[PDB]
């Protein structure tokens, strides 16, 4: 009754890999939101940093 005990342990181990992934799921989703927020806002900054009006405002910012 071995091969069967071994097949049964593999299917229990299978349940466990399941539990762990599905646990991990909700954190991936939340973090997808976080990494998108970070990626799209850094890029707005990069765009702003090469906009001539910004470049101009940024040099007159000190003299005021």
């Amino acid at each position: 009754r071995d091969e069967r005990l071994s097949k049964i342990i593999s299917m229990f181990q299978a349940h466990i890999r399941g539990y762990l992934i599905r646990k991990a799921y909700k954190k991936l989703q939340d973090q997808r939101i976080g990494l998108s927020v970070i990626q799209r806002n850094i890029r707005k900054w990069l765009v702003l940093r090469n906009w001539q009006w910004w470049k101009l405002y940024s040099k007159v910012k000190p003299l005021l």
């Binding site: 939340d30 973090q31 997808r32 939101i33 976080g34 990494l35 998108s36 927020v37 970070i38 990626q39 799209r40 806002n41 850094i42 890029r43 707005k44 900054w45 990069l46 702003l48 940093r49 906009w51 001539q52 009006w53 910004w54 470049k55 101009l56 405002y57 040099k59 007159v60 910012k61 003299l63 005021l64």
Partner: protein, 142 residues
Amino acid sequence: LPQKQIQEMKEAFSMIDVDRDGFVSKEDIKAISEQLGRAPDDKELTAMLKEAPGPLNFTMFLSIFSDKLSGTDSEETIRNAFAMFDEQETKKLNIEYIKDLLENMGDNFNKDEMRMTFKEAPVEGGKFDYVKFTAMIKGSGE
């Protein structure tokens, strides 16, 4: 824009408005630029003026900034997004972890967005300061 900010642009505007007539011309921008350092080339001056639909008084000035400066997340939103990756609330991220996130995952940064982001970034002892970086990225620092 906030009032303090709207009020800051008024003062920026009346220094850019070199001839004080109340509009900003290609000539004003050039006079004030050449005054601050290397001026942009007149092809570039032409073009930033093409950004105002009509005459460039303060109202139209305010408005081109407000359009550019909107559609971006608050500082709290951006700081919390970073904090999702900082479970101990240490308020830093290891430098290698944040590069790996940005470059390799999501909508990947290319070498030049990577080069440019971290040219500016507050990094010390292998830790990226996302609280400070967020202020920098939103102007509550830089």
